[PDB]
């Protein structure tokens, strides 16, 4: 029962951890996508800066 309760708490916890993990995955991906766009936008302005600097 301790081991079964262990599993119920742990399985639920493992799921909570799976969810927190999924949440960190979603959040890092959103943040990463912000970074993809922040970096993309950076590239657009950095590229434009090069073009504008060249100009």
């Amino acid at each position: 029962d301790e081991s079964e309760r262990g599993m119920k708490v742990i399985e639920s916890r493992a799921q909570k951890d799976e969810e927190k993990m999924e949440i960190q995955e979603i959040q890092l991906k959103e943040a990463k996508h912000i970074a993809e766009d922040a970096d993309r936008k950076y590239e657009e302005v950095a590229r434009k800066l090069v073009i504008i600097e060249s100009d």
Partner: protein, 160 residues
Amino acid sequence: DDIYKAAVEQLTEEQKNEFKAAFDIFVLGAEDGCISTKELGKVMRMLGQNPTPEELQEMIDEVDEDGSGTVDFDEFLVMMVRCMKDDSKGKSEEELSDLFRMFDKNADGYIDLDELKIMLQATGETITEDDIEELMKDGDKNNDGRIDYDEFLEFMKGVE
């Protein structure tokens, strides 16, 4: 309005039939015919696009202008052409080369703002002070102040 009409005009019969058949997965049956936005990622893949999870979410983020939580059928076609560019034929370089030459009245190898305005006002469509420049800045990828032959071909791919 007209972007939604145009996406419908640009999809061929063998494609629009798949788009509506797959898009109808958005309603579960015996509901209200809502057609929800969360199902967009699934349909992109059902129709042959191969997006990542970030891309699936971007398609969702770009719809639902009114906060309704749904996607219409014409709205779907507009969102799909911005993801998977299934236009109708999309013409060719030879066809656009001959048409390019018509806007290039002075044979300079590019379309400047005056030619761009004359050709459009000539259609009967009213051209306002900010128009024309808005297209020139779209075709003019190199920021040289005009749309040249190469830029023209990129600019009008998928245009009828």
